[PDB]
Specification:
The complex is a heterodimer of chains A (457) and B (113). Chain A has 457 residues and is α/β, with parallel strands linked by helices. Chain A is 35% helix and 18% strand. The radius of gyration of chain B is 13 Å and the shape is globular. Bound molecules: flavin-adenine dinucleotide (FAD) and FE2/S2 (inorganic) cluster. Chain A: Its cofactor is FAD.
């Protein structure tokens, strides 16, 4: 029989789940996972908050997959740069793009470049050890911080900003960020959304965590939930409980115990509705951000292309830190692959890249940056399946295929030294040791050149 | 395994197996090496919904009281029924022997948007 050679571009949840599916449903298929970072797992390592270790458990299943004899890892290989997609298509039977959505949604407003304005995801990569963000060194000396957008990512940075530093002591949070967080004078966090309460993008788990965060109290305006009760009682299961928790918190008087807790709280988080960022207001010396001008908006223009539009009235909000968490978009990495700049994804029909035989995709680069790990997982399985289905039907390149035998020699000729999964395990073991002393799960290596020095690279 | 449990996989196929009382169905699944597409991703820590299972009515009624922590993850699960529970939260009992749990399939493409 044929021995399928499959290539996966990206080592995050979508790439590892697609490979997992391929290995499980085809006994001879081989999967080579390429990754531009020196280490695997993508956002499970760099995105998921350090106080959410339970979620990082999917890493155990990816490690199991990577250890399979029919799987190989190739970190420090940036597809489209070190190796082109066309070159991978020549080497493999099928190529699956799973490189997530890297680009951040710019605010595109006056003063969005003022110091103190960061991408919410840059702040996250900061404390999660993404190398490119290790020198973010955000100024946490100001009292208020404003987060634009009301998704889970917003709740994550707002939670990390208000969590008592000591409670983060033994998580895998970078020691660097934990040190900064200890000196932080941030005590007020506002999460502002363009739309209303019925449109919040976060889930009940993360909201509940926020409502119960030690040392904090919630700041919800009862007026934002007026004539909204009956619509909540009719919402769908996923939505109902979430909304009822917000409504309850926003309109019901807390018990004696809860009230006492809040009266004692020293930090606070709140939710603002119907406000779109109009401009970041500068400080007296115009050297930093001192606040943000929010335009009051209205639900106007409804239907498919529904959007909030400024009424003309504004509101200036004092704040020393402004975090933009308004989604993201994938980016094209190779001129050989089609791209939908409007939706920010690689055009595809349920996994099949448009007009490119043998080319597939999964994860955020396929559906957009709106799914948790479980969503990405079941989506990635569907792609692995449509690929196996094309294989059986004979719609993928016939015969031979050298796979890595070709790419290895190619990357070699180009002076690119790949990081294998076993090399990663030496690094992993090192980070775990450094976590021993301080009692943390690990102490992430942030210096690119040191990580390579370890591996002997 | 002192008791028997039947798992109706997504592809119609049934996977019978035994698991000693006290174990969560995730334990029954994992240790018995049952092939259920991405079942128990967070390894039973209430961080996912991949261990979602549809129990028999005559058994659902007498299961441990469901917590908010479980409902929080269950709301994000597809193929949700009135007899749904997170498998890793249900520890086996003597009265569960020979029961039949069904892994949710159907059209979940709706969760991908
Ligand atoms: C701040 C934050 C917190 C989150 N918290 C949670 C949570 O608590 N629970 C949850 O379930 N989900 C959470 N998620 C969502 C989860 O991280 C995503 O659903 C998941 O990472 C999607 O996987 P992916 O495979 O599409 O892409 P990603 O994980 O982004 O991985 C894409 C991979 O491709 C690599 N890559 C990019 N370009 C190239 C290239 N040219 N060549 C080679 N490799 C390349 C990237 O470096 C990366 O490793 C969170 C997301 C964020 C941003
Ligand atoms: S295995 Fe994750 S919640 Fe049950």
């Amino acid at each position: 029989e044929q021995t399928p050679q499959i290539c996966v571009v990206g080592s995050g949840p979508a790439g590892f789940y697609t490979a997992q599916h391929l290995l499980k449903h085809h006994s001879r298929a081989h999967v080579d996972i390429y990754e531009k970072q020196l280490v695997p797992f993508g956002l499970v390592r760099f995105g998921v908050a350090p106080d959410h270790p339970e979620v990082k458990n999917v890493i155990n299943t990816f490690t199991q997959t990577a250890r399979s004899d029919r799987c190989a890892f190739y970190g420090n290989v940036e597809v489209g740069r070190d190796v082109t997609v066309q070159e991978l298509q020549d080497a493999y039977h099928a190529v699956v793009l799973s490189y997530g959505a890297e680009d951040h949604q710019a605010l595109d407003i006056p003063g969005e470049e003022l110091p103190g304005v960061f991408s919410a995801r840059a702040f996250v990569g900061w404390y999660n050890g993404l190398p490119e963000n290790r020198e973010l060194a955000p100024d946490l000396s100001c009292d208020t911080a404003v987060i634009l957008g009301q998704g889970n990512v917003a709740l994550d940075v707002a939670r990390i900003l208000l969590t008592p530093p000591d409670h983060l002591e033994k998580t895998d949070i970078t020691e660097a960020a934990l040190g900064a967080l200890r000196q932080s004078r941030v005590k007020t966090v506002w999460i502002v959304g363009r739309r209303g309460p019925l449109q919040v993008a976060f889930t009940i788990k993360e909201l509940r965590e926020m409502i119960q965060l030690p040392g904090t109290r919630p700041m919800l305006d009862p007026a934002d939930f007026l004539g909204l009760q009956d619509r909540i009682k009719e919402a769908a299961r996923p939505r109902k409980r979430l909304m009822e928790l917000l409504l309850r918190t926003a309109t019901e008087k807390p018990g004696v115990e809860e009230a006492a807790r809040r009266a004692s709280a020293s930090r606070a988080w709140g939710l603002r509705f119907f406000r779109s960022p109009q401009q970041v207001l500068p400080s007296p010396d115009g050297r930093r951000a001192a606040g943000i001008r929010l335009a009051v908006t209205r639900l106007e223009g409804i239907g498919e292309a529904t959007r909030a539009v400024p009424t003309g009235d504004v509101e200036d909000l004092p704040c020393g830190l402004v975090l933009s968490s308004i989604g993201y978009k994938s980016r094209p990495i190779d001129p050989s692959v089609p791209f939908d700049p409007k939706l920010g994804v690689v055009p595809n029909m349920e996994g099949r890249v448009v007009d490119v035989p043998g080319l597939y995709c999964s994860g955020w680069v396929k559906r957009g940056p709106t799914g948790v790990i479980t969503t990405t997982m079941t989506d990635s399985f569907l792609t692995g399946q449509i690929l196996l289905q094309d294989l059986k039907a004979g719609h993928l390149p016939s015969g031979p295929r050298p796979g890595s035998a070709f790419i290895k020699a190619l990357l070699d000729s180009r002076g690119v030294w790949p990081v294998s999964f076993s090399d990663w395990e030496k690094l992993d073991a090192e980070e775990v040791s450094r976590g021993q002393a301080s009692g943390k799960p690990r102490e992430k290596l942030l210096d690119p050149q040191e990580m390579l020095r370890l591996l002997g690279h | 395994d002192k008791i028997t449990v039947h798992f109706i996989n997504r592809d119609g196929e049934t996977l019978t197996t035994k698991g000693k009382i006290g174990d969560s169905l995730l334990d029954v699944v994992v240790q018995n090496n049952l092939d259920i597409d991405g079942f128990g991703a967070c390894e039973g820590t209430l961080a996912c919904s991949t261990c979602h299972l549809i129990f028999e009515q005559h058994i659902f009624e007498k299961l441990e009281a469901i917590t908010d922590e479980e409902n929080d993850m269950l709301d994000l699960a597809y193929g949700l029924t009135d007899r749904s529970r997170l498998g890793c939260q249900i520890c086996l009992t003597k009265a569960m022997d020979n029961m039949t749990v069904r892994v949710p399939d159907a059209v979940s493409d709706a969760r991908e948007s």
